[PDB]
């Protein structure tokens, strides 16, 4: 029993984290085989930030301009290139701790673990979701750029986020590991602002299933709703539309608990319209939306890595 915000074991990723310094600017990099991946804004002086031309700033650098430190070992950079908003520093040594891995670009609403790092040293691990507006609600200070987000499947680490920057509202923006930003954001000092965010409906439903699995039924009712009618209430409360695909994804959890997806939707509609009346669900007084259906199956059934 119990239900926690649960991150993947971070060990496979810890062994990949390094420090990258260029001039007076330092941040973290990701060492896989003989390549170190990091945010390209490492090559930027603060004076370069309002409208950087990175192709220009990079042609002006040499391999020796990049200091890569793996613990207490300097790695020598033997080559460099830009791919989108990430730098790839080729180094003389392959990482002997390179896990089995892939790079994936996730969809909004998907969750991942973040290994927050400073000076190439891991500091903490937490879970978060890619918001519908393509920000993440992370926990990041100066120095944390280059920390990565990931999921683990068996022994394969799927990297899906590299951290770059913090927006004025205190939420976070970054790229996939091939350097493409999530959302409309650019690695320039400019006015940029997240689009208005929405609640991830399919995740809220999954978490209500998690609550049922853990013995909490107070919010259930005997009504059903139609998809169309539920989606009408969703839009009024700033919830993402629920699709037939979402319904299908929630299939396994509906099956385990015997609660039809559309019946759970009637529960959620009541919760949206009436509040919680001083009650909690899995220890929250808010409707939680950063557990995917997969997260719930993973934790209520006990899958390992």
């Amino acid at each position: 029993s119990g239900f926690r915000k649960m991150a993947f074991p971070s060990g496979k990723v810890e062994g990949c984290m390094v420090q990258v310094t260029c001039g007076t600017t330092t941040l973290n990099g990701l060492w896989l085989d003989d390549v170190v991946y990091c945010p390209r804004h490492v090559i930027c002086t603060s004076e370069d930030m309002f409208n950087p031309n990175y192709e220009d700033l990079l042609i002006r650098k040499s391999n020796h301009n990049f200091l890569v430190q793996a613990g207490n070992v300097q790695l020598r950079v033997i080559g460099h290139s830009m791919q989108n908003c990430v730098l790839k520093l080729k180094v003389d040594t392959a990482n002997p701790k390179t896990p089995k891995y892939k790079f994936v670009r996730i969809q909004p609403g998907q969750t991942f673990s973040v290994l927050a790092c400073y000076n190439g040293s891991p500091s903490g691990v937490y879970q978060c979701a890619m918001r519908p507006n393509f920000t993440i609600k992370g926990s990041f200070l100066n120095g944390s750029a280059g920390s990565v987000g990931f999921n683990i499947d068996y022994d394969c680490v799927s990297f899906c986020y590299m951290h770059h920057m913090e927006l004025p509202t205190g939420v976070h923006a970054g790229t996939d590991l091939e350097g493409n930003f999530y959302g409309p954001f650019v690695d320039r000092q400019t006015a940029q602002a997240a689009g208005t965010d929405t609640t991830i409906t399919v995740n809220v439903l999954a978490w209500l299933y998690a609550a049922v699995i853990n013995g909490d039924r107070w919010f259930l009712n005997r009504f059903t709703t139609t998809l169309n009618d539920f989606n009408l209430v969703a839009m009024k409360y700033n919830y993402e539309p629920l699709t037939q695909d979402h319904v299908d994804i929630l299939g396994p959890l509906s099956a385990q608990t015997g609660i039809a997806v559309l019946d759970m939707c009637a529960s959620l509609k009541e919760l949206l319209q009436n509040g919680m009346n001083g009650r909690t669900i899995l220890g929250s007084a808010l409707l939680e939306d950063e557990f995917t259906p997969f997260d719930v199956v993973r934790q209520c059934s006990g899958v390992t890595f």
Partner: peptide
């Protein structure tokens, strides 16, 4: 008002 790039100064 502005984005903060979260590198650090060495």
């Amino acid at each position: 008002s502005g984005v903060t790039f979260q590198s650090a100064v060495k």
